[PDB]
Amino acid sequence: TNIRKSHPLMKIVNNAFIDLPAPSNISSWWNFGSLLGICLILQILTGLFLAMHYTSDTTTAFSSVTHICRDVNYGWIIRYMHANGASMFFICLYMHVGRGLYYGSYTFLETWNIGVILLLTVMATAFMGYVLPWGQMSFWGATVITNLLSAIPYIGTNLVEWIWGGFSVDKATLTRFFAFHFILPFIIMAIAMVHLLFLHETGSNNPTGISSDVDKIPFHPYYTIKDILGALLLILALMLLVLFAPDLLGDPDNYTPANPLNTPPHIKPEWYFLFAYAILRSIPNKLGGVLALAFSILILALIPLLHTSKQRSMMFRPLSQCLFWALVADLLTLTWIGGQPVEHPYITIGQLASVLYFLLILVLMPTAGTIENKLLKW
Amino acid sequence: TNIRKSHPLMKIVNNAFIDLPAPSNISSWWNFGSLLGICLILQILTGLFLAMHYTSDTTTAFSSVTHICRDVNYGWIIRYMHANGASMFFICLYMHVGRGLYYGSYTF
Amino acid sequence: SHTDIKVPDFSDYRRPEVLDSTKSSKESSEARKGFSYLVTATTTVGVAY
Amino acid sequence: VSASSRWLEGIRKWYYNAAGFNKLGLMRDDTIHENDDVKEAIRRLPENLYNDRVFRIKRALDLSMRQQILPKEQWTKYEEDKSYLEPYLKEVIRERKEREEWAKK
Amino acid sequence: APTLTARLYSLLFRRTSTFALTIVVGALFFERAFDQGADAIYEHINEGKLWKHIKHKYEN
Amino acid sequence: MLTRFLGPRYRQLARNWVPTASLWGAVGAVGLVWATDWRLILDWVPYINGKF
Amino acid sequence: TATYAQALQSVPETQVSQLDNGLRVASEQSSQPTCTVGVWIDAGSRYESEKNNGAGYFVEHLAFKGTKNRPGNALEKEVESMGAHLNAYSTREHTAYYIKALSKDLPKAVELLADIVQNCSLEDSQIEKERDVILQELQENDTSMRDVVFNYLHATAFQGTPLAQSVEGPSENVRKLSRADLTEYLSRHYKAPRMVLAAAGGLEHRQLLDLAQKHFSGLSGTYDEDAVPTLSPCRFTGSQICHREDGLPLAHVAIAVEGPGWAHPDNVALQVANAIIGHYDCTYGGGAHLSSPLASIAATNKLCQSFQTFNICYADTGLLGAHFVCDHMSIDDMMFVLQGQWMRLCTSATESEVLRGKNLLRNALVSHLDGTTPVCEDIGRSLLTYGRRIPLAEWESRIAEVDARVVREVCSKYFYDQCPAVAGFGPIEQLPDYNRIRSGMFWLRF
Amino acid sequence: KAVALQNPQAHVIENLHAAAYRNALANSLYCPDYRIGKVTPVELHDYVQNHFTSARMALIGLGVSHPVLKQVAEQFLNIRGGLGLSGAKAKYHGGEIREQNGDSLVHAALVAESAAIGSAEANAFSVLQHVLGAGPHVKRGSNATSSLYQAVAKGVHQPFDVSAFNASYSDSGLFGFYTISQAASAGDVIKAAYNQVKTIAQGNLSNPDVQAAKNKLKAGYLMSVESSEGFLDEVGSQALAAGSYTPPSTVLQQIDAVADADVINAAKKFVSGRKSMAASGNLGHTPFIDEL
Numbered sequence A: 001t002n003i004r005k006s007h008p009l010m011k012i013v014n015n016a017f018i019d020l021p022a023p024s025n026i027s028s029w030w031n032f033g034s035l036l037g038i039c040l041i042l043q044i045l046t047g048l049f050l051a052m053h054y055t056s057d058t059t060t061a062f063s064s065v066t067h068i069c070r071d072v073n074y075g076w077i078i079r080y081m082h083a084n085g086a087s088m089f090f091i092c093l094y095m096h097v098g099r100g101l102y103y104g105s106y107t108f109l110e111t112w113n114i115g116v117i118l119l120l121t122v123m124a125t126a127f128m129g130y131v132l133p134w135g136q137m138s139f140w141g142a143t144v145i146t147n148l149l150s151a152i153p154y155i156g157t158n159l160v161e162w163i164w165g166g167f168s169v170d171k172a173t174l175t176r177f178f179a180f181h182f183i184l185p186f187i188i189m190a191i192a193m194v195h196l197l198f199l200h201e202t203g204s205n206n207p208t209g210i211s212s213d214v215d216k217i218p219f220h221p222y223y224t225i226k227d228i229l230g231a232l233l234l235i236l237a238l239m240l241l242v243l244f245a246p247d248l249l250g251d252p253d254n255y256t257p258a259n260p261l262n263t264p265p266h267i268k269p270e271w272y273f274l275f276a277y278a279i280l281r282s283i284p285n286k287l288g289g290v291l292a293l294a295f296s297i298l299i300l301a302l303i304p305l306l307h308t309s310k311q312r313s314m315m316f317r318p319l320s321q322c323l324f325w326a327l328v329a330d331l332l333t334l335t336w337i338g339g340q341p342v343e344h345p346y347i348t349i350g351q352l353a354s355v356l357y358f359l360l361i362l363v364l365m366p367t368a369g370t371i372e373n374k375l376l377k378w
Numbered sequence B: 001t002n003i004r005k006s007h008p009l010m011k012i013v014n015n016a017f018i019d020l021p022a023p024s025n026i027s028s029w030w031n032f033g034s035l036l037g038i039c040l041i042l043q044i045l046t047g048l049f050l051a052m053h054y055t056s057d058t059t060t061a062f063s064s065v066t067h068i069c070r071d072v073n074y075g076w077i078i079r080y081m082h083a084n085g086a087s088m089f090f091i092c093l094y095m096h097v098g099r100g101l102y103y104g105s106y107t108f
Numbered sequence C: 001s002h003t004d005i006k007v008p009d010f011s012d013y014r015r016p017e018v019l020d021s022t023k024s025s026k027e028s029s030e031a032r033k034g035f036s037y038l039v040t041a042t043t044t045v046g047v048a049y
Numbered sequence D: 001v002s003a004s005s006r007w008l009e010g011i012r013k014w015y016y017n018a019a020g021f022n023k024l025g026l027m028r029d030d031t032i033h034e035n036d037d038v039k040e041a042i043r044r045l046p047e048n049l050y051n052d053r054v055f056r057i058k059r060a061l062d063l064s065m066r067q068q069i070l071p072k073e074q075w076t077k078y079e080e081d082k083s084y085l086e087p088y089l090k091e092v093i094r095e096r097k098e099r100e101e102w103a104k105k
Numbered sequence E: 001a002p003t004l005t006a007r008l009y010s011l012l013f014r015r016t017s018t019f020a021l022t023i024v025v026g027a028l029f030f031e032r033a034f035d036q037g038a039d040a041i042y043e044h045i046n047e048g049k050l051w052k053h054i055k056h057k058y059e060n
Numbered sequence F: 001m002l003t004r005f006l007g008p009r010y011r012q013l014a015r016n017w018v019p020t021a022s023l024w025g026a027v028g029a030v031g032l033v034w035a036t037d038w039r040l041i042l043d044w045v046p047y048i049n050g051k052f
Numbered sequence G: 001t002a003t004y005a006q007a008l009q010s011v012p013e014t015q016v017s018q019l020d021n022g023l024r025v026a027s028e029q030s031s032q033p034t035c036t037v038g039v040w041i042d043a044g045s046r047y048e049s050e051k052n053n054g055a056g057y058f059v060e061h062l063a064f065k066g067t068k069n070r071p072g073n074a075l076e077k078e079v080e081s082m083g084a085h086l087n088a089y090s091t092r093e094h095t096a097y098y099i100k101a102l103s104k105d106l107p108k109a110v111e112l113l114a115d116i117v118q119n120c121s122l123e124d125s126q127i128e129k130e131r132d133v134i135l136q137e138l139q140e141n142d143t144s145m146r147d148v149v150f151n152y153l154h155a156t157a158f159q160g161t162p163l164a165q166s167v168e169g170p171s172e173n174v175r176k177l178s179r180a181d182l183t184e185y186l187s188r189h190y191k192a193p194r195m196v197l198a199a200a201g202g203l204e205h206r207q208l209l210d211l212a213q214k215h216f217s218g219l220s221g222t223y224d225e226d227a228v229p230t231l232s233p234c235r236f237t238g239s240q241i242c243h244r245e246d247g248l249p250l251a252h253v254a255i256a257v258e259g260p261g262w263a264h265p266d267n268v269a270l271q272v273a274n275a276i277i278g279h280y281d282c283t284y285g286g287g288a289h290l291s292s293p294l295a296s297i298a299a300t301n302k303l304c305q306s307f308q309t310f311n312i313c314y315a316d317t318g319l320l321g322a323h324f325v326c327d328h329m330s331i332d333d334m335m336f337v338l339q340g341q342w343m344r345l346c347t348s349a350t351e352s353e354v355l356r357g358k359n360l361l362r363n364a365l366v367s368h369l370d371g372t373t374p375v376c377e378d379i380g381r382s383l384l385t386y387g388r389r390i391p392l393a394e395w396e397s398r399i400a401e402v403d404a405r406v407v408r409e410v411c412s413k414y415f416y417d418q419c420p421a422v423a424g425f426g427p428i429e430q431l432p433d434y435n436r437i438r439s440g441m442f443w444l445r446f
Numbered sequence H: 001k002a003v004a005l006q007n008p009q010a011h012v013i014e015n016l017h018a019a020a021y022r023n024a025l026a027n028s029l030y031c032p033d034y035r036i037g038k039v040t041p042v043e044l045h046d047y048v049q050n051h052f053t054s055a056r057m058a059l060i061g062l063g064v065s066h067p068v069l070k071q072v073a074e075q076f077l078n079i080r081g082g083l084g085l086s087g088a089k090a091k092y093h094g095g096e097i098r099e100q101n102g103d104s105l106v107h108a109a110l111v112a113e114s115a116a117i118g119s120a121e122a123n124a125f126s127v128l129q130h131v132l133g134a135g136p137h138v139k140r141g142s143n144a145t146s147s148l149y150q151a152v153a154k155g156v157h158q159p160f161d162v163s164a165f166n167a168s169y170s171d172s173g174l175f176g177f178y179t180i181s182q183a184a185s186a187g188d189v190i191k192a193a194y195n196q197v198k199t200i201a202q203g204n205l206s207n208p209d210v211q212a213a214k215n216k217l218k219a220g221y222l223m224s225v226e227s228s229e230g231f232l233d234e235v236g237s238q239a240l241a242a243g244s245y246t247p248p249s250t251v252l253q254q255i256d257a258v259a260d261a262d263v264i265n266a267a268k269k270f271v272s273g274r275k276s277m278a279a280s281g282n283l284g285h286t287p288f289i290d291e292l
């Protein structure tokens, strides 16, 4: 009868975007899934058009970006769309993660763990992207981050020199970082397809955490038009930055060419890495700080195993709500400390915040969930 | 019962590669389609290792390729593998097309 | 009928170790399996190298 | 109605009202997370209790969609909350633990 | 059992873990054996031409 | 809190499966040493030692 | 007040004697009033070439059709004069005739049996009538699918040897069998060294011995010339046979491996192992709580209508395996689960399941021998296979010595990494290829 | 039920019971097809509470002592007392049921009211059953002694089968015969068997045949109870029916006590009673009751 349902290619589109049963009551916090895909396609298109006028030679990499922003027709708009798009990408990532943490979506183990893989691959992609323009922050970011492997005993220096392709950061490091930054987004897109593959087996959670099979609506036209509205708001947020404050989220030192002989005094990472920078430097120890750095991200993989509450969502769990917002404010504290110099009293504040982060994740929230279970007599 | 036939991801591979019913009398000409699957991946691998040493600037392109040939460890092997893989790919491709034309596979 | 069923003679394809119908096959089985698995092991060693 | 009992019950009634699922007409057992023990217990419920659970959950999802709550008269009173599901889940758990105990010997 | 193949089957090829262990050990020794043989053949075919054959003349 | 797996049956199963696990571990160790060309171990092997 | 061991020790002992012609007379006294007496013979289809295959079944058909001294249908009337039940059967290695009657009829009943196995008249008209009846039976035997599949398993497993030949024989042979062939078969195979005269019930051993001396002293037992048919080892072949008939509703499958033989110590362990796997039918009442993993899985998921395990023994060979009847869309699942259970037994067996299987074998052994016909059958088969009847105390001693280690070693010997024989009949399009079945006989993890 | 209905005998016998009786013994052994899925726990509770009571129970043991069973019964089975219902009485009516299903062979059964179990006439009906024929005693036998088979086979020259059917209960019983024959020859077989029973009824019966039937009955009864299963079943049936155990010797004496005139009286009771017939198959030539 209907060729939309029977054609071998269209059945995937129908069973993924048209006839998909979806809960009738998913709020605006479920929009960031599609916005992450809009962002990923934006970065692929803009980046591809930036690669038509970029050279990864150490002697000309800096000048090719100026050639883009000066001589290429509307090259500036493409350049700053790609740069600000990366920041919008990380805003959507952290909101997607916090959504899943608050509403108990982590109980989808396969979907959650594939998500953690996507987070790490997007982090590596954005880290390598920042090295290409070859400014001051590019060079010392590549130096520090690659040197993190030196903490590994007995093989660290070999791993560092193997990745650099030499005894120091040089042309070979930039050429290979360009190849990695080119190819890694397509692998990300494939893993995002497996993310949705595992998701579609069970369908979506909802704000109440209660099964919604009694009340399902088709994805089209309800969440197609709601996702279009959310996309239009993303375009608004991006173009405000690009057209009124294109340098607000960047660093001025990157507009100076690289200099291996001098490091700037106020070197700080991009804003979306400062919290982990704060975690690392709060430990006065090389290996200890590197392990705390890795565990500050990998603990998300442990989050599914610490769920003790008999209710899925935090909507009906006040104590968990309060601890959740104490965790959000603590992450804002670590970001602030990450952006300040290493002096009294910031050192002790950053240590207390680093301790509070793991204390909240590991100890307090499971105990709250158990107190809540006992209060309801089950 | 069997995880291979019920897991969401392994089920696709099972239905595509492991339990696929195929005819019992297909000759060697049906292998070329698989070979095109191999050669493509080969060109994706070797080429990906040439991109780590290639610069697209017009003044430093020929020189970069000669640097790959002469200075990179075993770089000549990777370069000439990527170079001759094109000829192998096109031989396999023309054999695939001739096979399809002779045995009436174009009805699909 | 079905009792007329009778397997055709496979003797043209059998190995020399199992040609005789009046001899137990359990004695030669390990040699045959060991030969085939030796072939497989040699192939795997070469591919691994 | 002694010293510690009335204080414990006072804190439980406080928490019950603070959770706020009663504002959507729900009962406690309507909010439990569905694992295999709970799916089996729900399966064993008689027709009427099942249909009431279905309609209460459907009305709550409708309210959450509209971002509304019921009038105060229709809130689920703490003293009238019926643990209709508890005995079935308790039996299912007892059966699974018997199976697990047999698997050790 | 007197036959070599029967001993190999009854000793090594029954289990798969032992099969894998045999494979890796065989690869480990076969690498060195094959490398020495190939190098010997290549050196013999081109005697008096390689650098190592004329090295002694120049370095003191 | 995996306390379900403390009984005679599971210790019996572990006793049965220990040798295969040990053999797979040995396979992994030998494979790693052969792949990395780790001279620290390989210098003691008699016939291999001549390749350096 | 009593105990299991004391009860086992209290069973009366079988008493065996041997006449001069070579006949062996065994008996077991009991307090019951009835009794069962019979003659077992070591002659079946295995002792037949292609020329005269089916001769034994033909002779067995003509046994109860009059003799020289009781012509016509008189003999039958004599049995029904005393209300006795006269029965017979034939297999691939044995033949048996027996009578169930009262104690008082022990003199007359024996006098009938000696008449049957000595003086087969073989009237020509009766030969023609039984030829027609046997042709009708051969036509009608195609309706039983289980027996067809077992014949296919025998034909493929033991191809090129006497064990491939079926009991009834091909339809062409029966059309050409003549009275000369039947007389030659009787004169060659029915002889005193190969016969056993068993009895069980209310009787005394010496009376049976005296009656045997009266009525069986005429049998020849000299083995005239070198006419001494002796078996030889039979080659086993891993192979597949598939009869595709998509019109039928259900598929029958039977898979087997080579067994130890009649008189091996290993058999007891195998009988424990099969008891762990068990059996299932769609009408069983246990449901999903059954101890066997295969039975519980099949019951919950509806993988098959029924399955069972078998261990069929011959001289120095045998079949060991399973047979299931299932839907045409469930063969892969059943084969997967069955082979997984076999590998589980081979690699990892625990004490509890072995204890359960030992108890099952004890109960089956006790309950099977309860009456007069099963005891007489036990004596008759034992005296031909082992040369002596094994008491139940020895069976308990053999069974009690099995543990998890012995089961693991025996199963690893006979099942693991072996080429099986497979037979399938019906809608069997989903039956795996022989390479897949063969590869399922080991594990990569082990 | 489906498995039990693979055998045509089960279907024919259940229909025969439905036709012969009206209220009590008419109930089938299996559920009616319409009522499957409609049985509720309340029905089961009522059935057990009403019928499982001390006065209606018997506990038999083989291989255990007496004090153990007595202790178990006193501890548990005594509290279950509170004896409930009594049941109806068997009403005999007779009739016909014919169910055509187009199978290869026609099955039929013609019976009549005979007697109650544990009565003098029951032994006479058993002896008559063994006079007429109750299946073969020899593998692939010609049934030479069976009067019914020889009577039918004289006229009918096609494969067939016939036997005597007997079934006694606590208040009523059915006696008659069962036939299996091809569609064309069903009427011939039924007419021949009915004629043979009529000739026996008129008086033609030989004392040697009566003695042979008595020996068959004695041998069958003795050989039935050799096994543990048969012995337990016989003891339990006697315990429920009469509330006392009768050893085999007394049964043998009672069987021998039957006079040869009582068999003739039983045949007369059969020939002059309201018949009940059931049939199945291609019923294109089977007669009705009036035709016989």
Ligand code: HEM
Pocket: A029, A030, A031, A032, A033, A034, A036, A037, A096, A097, A100, A105, A106, A108, A111, A112, A114, A115, A116, A118, A119, A122, A188, A192, A195, A196, A199, A203, A204, A205, A206, A300
């Ligand atoms: C490139 C990165 C990612 C993309 C493109 C992506 C995409 C999506 C999409 C389209 C959905 C369905 C719509 C929605 O629920 O909003 C979804 C759901 C989900 N994602 Fe992601 N995701 C990404 C990364 C992650 C990460 C880092 C996590 C967690 C650590 C995660 C966890 C989840 C979960 C748990 C759900 C199910 C939510 C629910 O059913 O309520 N994803 N994702």
Ligand code: HEM
Pocket: A040, A043, A044, A047, A048, A050, A051, A054, A065, A079, A082, A083, A086, A089, A122, A125, A126, A129, A130, A131, A132, A133, A181, A182, A185
């Ligand atoms: C997830 C996808 C991507 C992310 C998050 C990302 C992120 C970034 C970031 C943060 C920069 C630094 C911009 C600056 O500081 O000036 C950058 C630069 C760059 N990216 Fe990407 N990128 C992505 C994909 C791609 C792709 C697919 C390509 C090409 C095929 C590409 C090509 C480039 C180039 C050529 C530059 C250097 C020019 C410049 O500095 O603006 N990017 N990228």
Ligand SMILES: Cc1c(-c2ccc(Cc3ccc(OC(F)(F)F)cc3)cc2)[nH]c2cc(Cl)ccc2c1=O
Pocket: A120, A121, A123, A124, A127, A137, A140, A141, A142, A144, A145, A267, A268, A269, A273, A276, A277, A280
């Ligand atoms: C700790 C640290 C960082 C830093 C860099 C990256 C992260 C997050 C991260 C971690 C791992 C990663 O790789 C992976 F994806 F796993 F492969 C990619 C990204 C967090 C912090 N960046 C600096 C940049 C400057 Cl310019 C100077 C100093 C610092 C400094 O001290």
